[PDB]
Each structure stands twice: as structure tokens, then as C-alpha cells.
Amino acid sequence: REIITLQLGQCGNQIGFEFWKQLCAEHGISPEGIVEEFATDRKDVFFYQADDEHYIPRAVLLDLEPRVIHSILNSPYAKLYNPENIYLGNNWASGFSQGEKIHEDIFDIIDREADGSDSLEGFVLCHSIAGGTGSGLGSYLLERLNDRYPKKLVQTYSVFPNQDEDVVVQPYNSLLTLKRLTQNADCVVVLDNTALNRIATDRLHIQNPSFSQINQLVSTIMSASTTTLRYPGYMNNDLIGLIASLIPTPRLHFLMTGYTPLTTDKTTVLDVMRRLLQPKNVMVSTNHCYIAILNIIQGEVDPTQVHKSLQRIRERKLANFIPWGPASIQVALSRKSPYLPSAHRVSGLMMANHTSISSLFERTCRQYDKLRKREAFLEQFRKEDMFKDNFDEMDTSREIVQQLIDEYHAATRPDYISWG
Amino acid sequence: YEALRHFLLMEDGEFAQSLSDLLFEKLPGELLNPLVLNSVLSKALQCSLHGDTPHASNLSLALKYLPEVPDVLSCLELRYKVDWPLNIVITEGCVSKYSGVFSFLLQLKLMMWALKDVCFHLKRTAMAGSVQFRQLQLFKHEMQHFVKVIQGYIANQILHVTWCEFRARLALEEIQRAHAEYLHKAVFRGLLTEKAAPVMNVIHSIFSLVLKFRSQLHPNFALMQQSYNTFKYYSHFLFKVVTKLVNRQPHLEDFLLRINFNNY
């Protein structure tokens, strides 16, 4: 039914602003919400059917120390949506304590749109991991969000914060955010700033406006993830229907992203399926092997050859996916979305459960381990001491991330009929 | 054609996902009277924006059997009505077979309901991270996956390949023959044939076990685990039975790659 989206932090507000602009550009609408004359499709998934034939997006704005919010304010995309949801540190503990005192008024902002909506389906979170203002605040609000409504779903769009060296408190912040990301979130789509920066320096020669182009990438991914919902499809026209197949085990919910063209500034089915399969078109970067893959295709595609394509990708036999109960790489096929001009027609997006993210988790765990052992980089503040005097929240997150690495590695084993 | 495909074969979502979702909230003779049965269609059409078309009318809803109720039986009739000069092309023996394939598609959505039920019942006790919890839930995902691959197979055959050869199949008698071939390929790729009847017979055993799995929520761990073991045995047995009947059909060859993919 109806999904309410959330954005917090300056990076999260940037990606949400770009997402709403990019769906305004996709749909046959004006930047005021007025429908165009050439419209149809389903436009109730994130757009409130507002009072002047406006499709107002339902977006929760959360900001602290507003810098980008003024730039969002003086724009012709503030006439598209304005639900009056604006409500005013760089540490996780500081953001946690600042979210502590004002939770009731932003919760009134939540309940306003909750009662304004007739139905509710899920909550999408635009949150920047170790983002300074976003960190701590987003973790606290995530905790209160899943506490209040256990009848809904949570997706969180996350980045892996490390530019490979800078800030020494960031592994603590991302670790505490990762603890809540495990136990208070039901689906996590993780992105790599390193992998996106490498692909941006690959296809182009830009490395300085990286945020602006990464906005374009994430908005395309978020729109392609929702095209079967926003346009009349048949399967996973709800969020939960999409989330259900991918997760065999309720803590194995980390979702890998790839995309079949790399440069965006006739081919057949099994071709782009095979290219989406490769890890070098995967834009997020002992054995590591996939649990289950789901893929969506959108473009000009001849539909009758897909079964022979399915056979050819089968006998090509590219991944030795899993040993215990039988998953698959699973296809979904969609139409290329109308109501806008379309270049680079054949475009695919893949959602996969892979244990290879345990390597990145062990990377930031090793960074935390060396910074904890050296003990000159905790940056002891009264915020962190008053939040936790013995700093055993780090210990709880540490044993939980150990359990998750154990879960990954024992799932990679042929025996996960015993738990571990 | 491009109206009835979205009602009886339900290609457009949030019509099925509303009509079946509305009916399953209730659970009988106070459910089969035409004040609740005649009203759910009119409410399901509004949340797909199918309504206010000249194809939103001529729809007549009914049911062909009354239950007094494990049960895998679901019963519904939807018809489309065409007048005198269109009665000569679409026949009313053709429409009866459309209702017949409609019930076949409807029985699959009961699984899509029951799996969400058992996923929902576990949600309030999901707090715990117990041994009895995780190993139980792995069963639920694995039963969900079987439906998600077989429904993808139906969602391939009965709508993409058989409709692509209906957008050039049509060309006066040739129109009647082309529509009669459309239904023919749908019932051929639908495994209603007597040759692939035992392949359909195992599907009942899968369906009934998931419905019995739904009723137990924690009650006791072993009773559902036994059903999971029998389910695994049945799926492994189906893979051999469908293999023999391709080794001895062209659309069924796709089912072999669907049910076994990087496993055995």
C-alpha cells in the first residue's frame, strides 16, 4: 500500500532530494505537483494524492545545523512537496543525546503523516553512516521507529564510510550504527563509497564532484528498485513481497547492488543477465558465494527467448551459490518506464545476498581493534561517558558483529543445519 | 482481450492483492451471499484504477461451490459478457474454460496468503534469538521459495510467451481460431494436461502441507520439522518425475531448469 520515507543528515537529505526530483522527472508531472496532459500508472506508493491534484511525496525531513536545508528551501522542488516537517554535533553520542530530548516532537511529525495516511506498508530510511549529524540521531530514531510499529518493515539505505584515509571516531560511530543496523533493521541495502568512487573515476575523470554524481547513481538505483511498484507490474508490487524471498535467515538481510551499464553519459537477454552476474559490474566491492540473487531488468527486451537465456546462463554455471537448502538466482522482468525520454534502454539491477560483505565488516572491525588497542583515538567526551560509563555498548556490538561474521562463515559451510 | 487478461489472469497487480486480501481477512453461508461477495469486486477495482471503464462492467461475480469449512479448495466465478455480434467469435464454451483456468490461478494465491500469515505470526516473537526460532524460520523461507519459483514459471509461460504469440496471431474465421489457440496454449503450458497430471498431483501435497504448517505458530518444534522433512522428500521426488516426462515436453523443459538450479 502506502510507504512513508525518511531522510536525515545532509547526505540523506541530498539523496532524498535527488530521488524526489528524479521521480518528478520520470513521472509526467510539473515541479508543482500538477499532472501533465499526456498521462496510467500507480502513483500512491510514495505520493500523497494532495488537495490541488498535487502528488505530494510523503517524506520525513530531519535536520540538525541546517546548511543544505536552505538550498532545498529556495528551489522549485519545494513547490512539489512541503509537508512542513522541518525541525532543527558530529558524534554518535552527541547526535544520540540531541535526539534524546526532542523525540516527542519529531514523533508527532511521524504520527502526523501516520494518521494522514490511510494505510501503511513500510518505512524507508535515508541515513548516512558515520555522517556526523546523521550518526547517533539516526540510530536513536531507528530504535524508536521499530519500537513503536512492529507491524511494518524497515529498509535503510546505507553507505560504507571509509575513503581509505582522517576522522578517528568514525569506526566507533559506524560500529554503534551497525549494531542498531543489525538488530533494529529488517533489510539493509549497503553501498560502498570506495567502489562508487572507483567506478566514477573509471567511466569519467571526475573525483571532486563525487557527491553530486553519486546522487545520480543512488537515485537511479532507488527508482529501478521501485519501478515494478510504481508502474503496473505483477510481482513484488509491495515492499514486503520483495523482501521475503531474499532472506532465508532473519539476520542475513544485507543486499548487494550491481547495474549492467557502467557508463551512462541489439543485445540479448542472457548477455545482460551474464554481465549483471559479474562482480566487476557489481558496484559494491576460503570461499565467498551468493546465498540468493534477485534481478530486475528494464528495457527493450524480446520476451520469448528468456527461457533459452535461462538455460544458457544455467549451463554456463557461473556461481556455485550455496550447499544447504536450495536458493536460486531469480529473475524479474519489467517494462522500460514511459512518460520520460529514455537513453541506454537495457538496464538491469540485481539484489543479492552475498557473504563477501563480511570482509568489509572485518575491515572496519580491524580498524576498530587497532584504534581501541592504541587508545588515543577514542576522543573521550562527556557525551560518550554519560551515554555509557563503561563503554560496554561497544562490547555488545562487538559480540553481535562477531556472531554475524560467524553466521556468514557458517552459512558458507555445508553445515548450517546446526546454528552458529 | 487486454481487459479480461487483467481480471481472469490478473496481470495487473493490486487487484488480486486486494480482492483475495479482503476475502481472507474474514476467514460458511454469510460469506457467500451477494452483499459481501457482490461488494468485494467493486472495492477491489478502485484500488487498481481499473474502474470507470466500459470493461469495468459486464463483470458478474459468483461461486461454483459452497463450503461448510488443510483445505486447498477455493471457489469463485468471474464472467465477461459480450453481445450478439461478438457472441459469434468468443463462445460461451470458451468463457467456461476461462473460468476454469481462473480457478487454477486462484489456488496458487492461497499459498501467497498462508506464507504471509505464518511470517506474520512469527513476527511478534521475533526479542528472542533462540535455537528453536532460527531453525524453524529456515523452514518457512524454504517453503516460500518453492512457491516463488513455481509462480515465476506460471508468470512466465501463461503471460509472456503465450501473449507475445497473440500480438501477431490475430489477423473472419481466423480471429475465432486465433483466440481458440490462445486458450489452447494457455491450457497446454498450464499443466492441466492428462500427461502431466501426476506432476500436478504432487503440487497438492505441497499446498496442503503449507496450509497445515500455517496453523502452528512456540507450540513444539518437532511437529513442524517433520513436515519440513516430508516436504523436502516430496520436492526431490517431483524433480525426478518431471525429468522423466521431458526425457520422454518443450515448455516443461524450462521447469527442469527452474526446480533444479545449482543444487541436486
The DSSP-derived string for chain B is: -TTGGGTTS--STTTHHHHHHHHTTT---SSSSTTTTTTHHHHHTTTTT--SSTTSSSEEEE-S------------EEEE---HHHHTTS-TTHHHHHHHHHHHHHHHHHHHHHHHHHHHHTTTT-----HHHHHHHHHHHHHHHHHHHHHHHHHHIIIIIHHHTTSSS---HHHHHHHHHHHHHHHHTTT-SSTTHHHHHHHHHHHHHHHHHHH-----HHHHHHHHHHHHHHHHHHHHHHHHHHH--HHHHHHHHHH-SS--
Q: Among A414, A144, A404, which residue's Cα sits nearest to residue B134?
A: A404
Query: CB-based contact (8 Å) between B168 and chain A?
Result: no
Please give, one letter per residue, the 3-state secondary structure of chain A.
Answer: CCEEEEEECHHHHHHHHHHHHHHHHHCCECCCCCECCCCCCCCCCCEEECCCCCEEECEEEECCCCCHHHHHHCCCCCCCCCCCCCCCCCCHHHHHHHHHHCHHHHHHHHHHHHHHCCCCCEEEEECCCCCCCCCCHHHHHHHHHHHHCCCCEEEEEEEECCCCCCCCCHHHHHHHHHHHHHHCCCEEEEEEHHHHHHHHHHHCCCCCCHHHHHHHHHHHHHHHHHHHHHCCCCCCCCHHHHHHHHCCCCCCCEEEEEECCCCCCCCCHHHHHHHHHCCCCECCCCCCCEEEEEEEEEECCCHHHHHHHHHHHHHHCCCCCCCCCCCCEEEEEEECCCCCCCCCCCEEEEEEEECCHHHHHHHHHHHHHHHHHHCCCCCCCHHHHHHCCCCCHHHHHHHHHHHHHHHHHHHHCCCCCCCC
Q: How long, in residues, is chain B?
A: 264
Closest CB from B13, B149, B262 relative to A232: B13
Strand B59-62 versus strand A329-335 pairing type: unpaired
Query: CB-based contact (8 Å) between B152 and chain A?
Result: yes
Residue whose grid cell is 504448517: B213
Find, in chain B, the residue whose alpha carbon is nearest to that of A312.
Answer: B257
Q: How long, in residues, is chain A?
A: 420
Strand A254-259 versus strand A290-299 pairing type: unpaired
Paired strand residues for B78: B61
Torsion of CA B39, B44, B50, B56, to 10 degrees: -20
- Cβ separation A330–B148 shorter than 8 A: yes
- Cβ separation B141–A249 shorter than 8 A: yes
Residue whose grid cell is 511525496: A57
At A410, list the grid cell.
Answer: 557458517
- Cβ separation B144–A42 shorter than 8 A: no
Residue type, A147: D
The method of structure determination was cryo-EM
Q: Are B4 and A32 in contact (CB under 8 A)?
A: no
| CA gap A267, A252 in Å, rounded | 34
Query: CB-based contact (8 Å) between B119 and chain A?
Result: yes
Chain centre distance of CA A309? 30
- Resolution expressed in Å: 7.8
In which order are the strands placed within the sheet that holds A329-335?
Answer: A59-62, A3-8, A122-126, A153-160, A187-192, A254-259, A347-354, A290-299, A329-335
- Cβ separation B13–A234 shorter than 8 A: yes
C-alpha distance across the termini of chain A, in Å: 37
Measured N-to-C along each axis, helices A170-183 and A357-374 cross at an angle, to the nearest 10 degrees, of 130
Planar angle of CA A169, A217, A191, nearest 5 degrees? 35
Q: Encode burial over B73-92: b for 16+ CB neighbours within 10 A, e otherwise.
A: ebebebbbeeeeeeeebbee
Q: Among A15, A56, A14, which residue's Cα sits nearest to residue A34?
A: A56
Q: Are A269 and A294 in contact (CB under 8 A)?
A: no
Q: Which residues, including other chains, have CB under 8 Å from residue A5's CB and lie 6 or more apart?
A: A16, A46, A57, A58, A59, A60, A123, A124, A126
C-alpha distance across the termini of chain B, in Å: 41
At B36, list the grid cell.
Answer: 459481501
Task: Kindly list the residues from chain A whose CB atom is less than 8 angstroms away from the CB atom of residue B262.
Answer: 317, 319-322, 328
Phi, psi of A52 (to 5 degrees): -125, 40
Region of A117 on the Ramachandran plot (φ > 0 left; ψ -120 to 50 alpha; else beta): beta
